[PDB]
Amino acid sequence: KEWQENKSWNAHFTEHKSQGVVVLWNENKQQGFTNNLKRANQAFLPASTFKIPNSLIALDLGVVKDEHQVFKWDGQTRDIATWNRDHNLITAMKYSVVPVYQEFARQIGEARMSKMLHAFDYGNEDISGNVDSFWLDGGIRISATEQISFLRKLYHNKLHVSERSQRIVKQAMLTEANGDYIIRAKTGYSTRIEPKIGWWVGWVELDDNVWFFAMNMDMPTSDGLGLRQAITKEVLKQEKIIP
Ligand SMILES: O=C(O)c1cc(O)cc(-c2ccc(C(=O)O)c(OCc3ccccc3)c2)c1
Numbered sequence: 001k002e003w004q005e006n007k008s009w010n011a012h013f014t015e016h017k018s019q020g021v022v023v024l025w026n027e028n029k030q031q032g033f034t035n036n037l038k039r040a041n042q043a044f045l046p047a048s049t050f051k052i053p054n055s056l057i058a059l060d061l062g063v064v065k066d067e068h069q070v071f072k073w074d075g076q077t078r079d080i081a082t083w084n085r086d087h088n089l090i091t092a093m094k095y096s097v098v099p100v101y102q103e104f105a106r107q108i109g110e111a112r113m114s115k116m117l118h119a120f121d122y123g124n125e126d127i128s129g130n131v132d133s134f135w136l137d138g139g140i141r142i143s144a145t146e147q148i149s150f151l152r153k154l155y156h157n158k159l160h161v162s163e164r165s166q167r168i169v170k171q172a173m174l175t176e177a178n179g180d181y182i183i184r185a186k187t188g189y190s191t192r193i194e195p196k197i198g199w200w201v202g203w204v205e206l207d208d209n210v211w212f213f214a215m216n217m218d219m220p221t222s223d224g225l226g227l228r229q230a231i232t233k234e235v236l237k238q239e240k241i242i243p
Pocket residue numbers: 048079080096098136187188189191192222225
């Protein structure tokens with residue numbers, strides 16, 4: 001009994017006029033939980049959650065030297081203000097700076113990128129489409145369930161890249177921490193191909209356990225993007241994982 005459905009969490013989506021799936025994995029008990037077993041195994045475009053493997057690959061191949069190397073703004077003014085500045089790996093991941101990671105993808109190239117995704121067993125391991133946007137509008141797909149499996153390898157330094165690469169990416173994933181918990185996670189927003197979805201994948205570190213998580217929800221407009229974290233935290237409080 002390693003997977004179990006719990007439809008009570010649907011109340012949180014409903015209260016917010018929303019549809020989606022939340023997947024939790026208790027590492028100690030080696031047990032999973034979700035409010036919709038079928039949606040949890042349906043594969044979607046990773047969108048900017050792909051910045052986790054993209055980062056690992058850029059670092060192992062030396063495209064990126066470390067988390068301090070500066071990537072200069074190219075001077076094109078884009079719609080997202082925080083993109084129009086210089087970034088390092090920490091801030092590029094935090095603000096989902098797509099044009100920085102498209103540069104990484106072009107430097108990596110099609111053959112290296114495909115070979116690395118096979119090694120990771122990442123999603124359907126399909127890179128068909130454009131070299132620098134296939135995670136936003138090409139052939140790659142991945143499920144919430146498949147995200148957790150990838151994230152667990154990363155937590156334990158099991159992926160087919162150096163341990164240094166995986167430690168740097170887990171540092172850059174840092175999102176929030178206090179005396180009660182640590183969250184390492186990555187947001188995503190898939191709008192180029194229907195259905196438009198928001199993502200949030202990562203884990204919650206406690207003193208004596210870690211809860212992995214992966215959620216996606218339908219997202220017609222950008223105004224509801226905060227619900228990704230809100231609905232996840234509401235599920236987390238219900239399960240007494242955070243206070
Ligand atoms: O990761 C997040 O949460 C996040 C948050 C955001 O505000 C925006 C995005 C994001 C990432 C990639 C694309 C793309 O497909 O290039 C994208 O669409 C273009 C676009 C949409 C809306 C306003 C300006 C521009 C949006 C992601």
